[PDB]
């Protein structure tokens, strides 16, 4: 079970980090300050050109990935045997 426990731990490692990033950063002996502040708020109730440059960069690498996939399938031995 050692390999499946590594695969499970890495996937859970994202949501554990996200839990600490989403916490009110004040220690639990002194955390009453942040709970008072959230109680007050409860009482009262990229740029476009940067995304275009990013997505065209992604599409360049997509095309190189698909061309190398087609060359690897074409130079395989079974498709040489089909073409002969």
């Amino acid at each position: 079970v050692h390999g499946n426990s590594d695969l499970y731990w890495k996937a859970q490692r994202y949501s554990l980090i996200r839990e600490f990033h989403s916490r009110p950063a004040l220690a639990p002996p002194l955390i009453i300050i942040s709970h008072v502040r959230l109680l007050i708020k409860w009482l009262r109730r990229l740029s476009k050109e940067a995304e275009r440059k990013l997505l065209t960069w992604e599409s360049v690498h997509k095309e190189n990935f698909l061309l190398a996939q087609a060359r690897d399938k074409r130079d395989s031995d079974s498709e040489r045997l089909k073409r002969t």
Binding site: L55, E58, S59, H61, K62, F65, L66
Partner: protein, 231 residues
């Protein structure tokens, strides 16, 4: 049809009733358009090209190539530069290639040059979501979406580049080769492979038939490995 010697011909082939049968054969010669000859051919070969020759003589042939599920006919009819295939011929044959499950015709007809922003009218997009077997899963999802075209609500209860509309179309009807081709043509590829993997696994848990749920889990594994390799 190669052409009184008429009365001669009606008196050594049939051997009886010359002038009545001559009136019959001349009735056939009134419509000599609808008559073909199979003489100087290969013999027991290339029957299909002569069927197309008879149907074009009696006159759409690209739509016949889709309907017979035979690709070499359509390919040879596109290399012939005398015809100069226009837009509405290619658009009609592409709808026949999408309603049926023929992905190699979709690849061949898009590579020839065709506008898809002019193609996907909302009438045609309404026709694609009605190519549904009535005892499937997407039929119940669309009917419950209208009970309270409406594919955005179907995505909500589950979750000019129009390539993403055809990707969502091919995922909801579980077409494997269609959805992979529409992934390879559109942009924003890493997020769309993870979105395809999510949507297929949600619909695979909700599937009644066991073979179709097995089919959807195999396709979702394919989209996961493509996002891994691209990233």
């Amino acid at each position: 049809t190669l052409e009184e010697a008429r009365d001669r011909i009606r008196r050594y082939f049939p051997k009886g009733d010359p002038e009545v049968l001559q009136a019959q054969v001349e009735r056939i010669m009134t419509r000599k358009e609808l008559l073909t000859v199979y003489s100087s051919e290969d013999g027991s070969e290339e029957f299909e090209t002569i069927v197309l020759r008879a149907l074009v003589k009696a006159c759409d042939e690209l739509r016949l190539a889709v309907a017979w599920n035979r690709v070499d006919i359509a390919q040879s009819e596109l290399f012939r530069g005398d015809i100069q295939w226009r837009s509405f011929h290619l658009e009609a044959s592409l709808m026949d290639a999408l309603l049926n499950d023929r992905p190699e015709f979709v690849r061949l007809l898009i590579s020839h040059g065709l506008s898809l922003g002019h193609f996907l009218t909302p009438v045609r997009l309404a026709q694609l979501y009605s190519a549904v077997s009535p005892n499937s899963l997407i039929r119940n999802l669309l009917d419950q979406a209208s009970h309270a075209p409406n594919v955005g609500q179907v995505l909500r209860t589950l979750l000019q580049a129009p390539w993403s509309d055809l990707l969502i179309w091919a995922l909801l009807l579980n077409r494997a080769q269609m959805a992979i081709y529409f992934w390879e043509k559109g942009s924003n590829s890493v997020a769309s492979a993870l979105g395809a993997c999510l949507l297929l696994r949600v619909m695979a848990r909700l599937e009644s038939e066991a073979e179709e749920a097995a089919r959807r889990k195999d396709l979702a594994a394919t989209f996961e490995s493509m996002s891994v390799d691209l990233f």
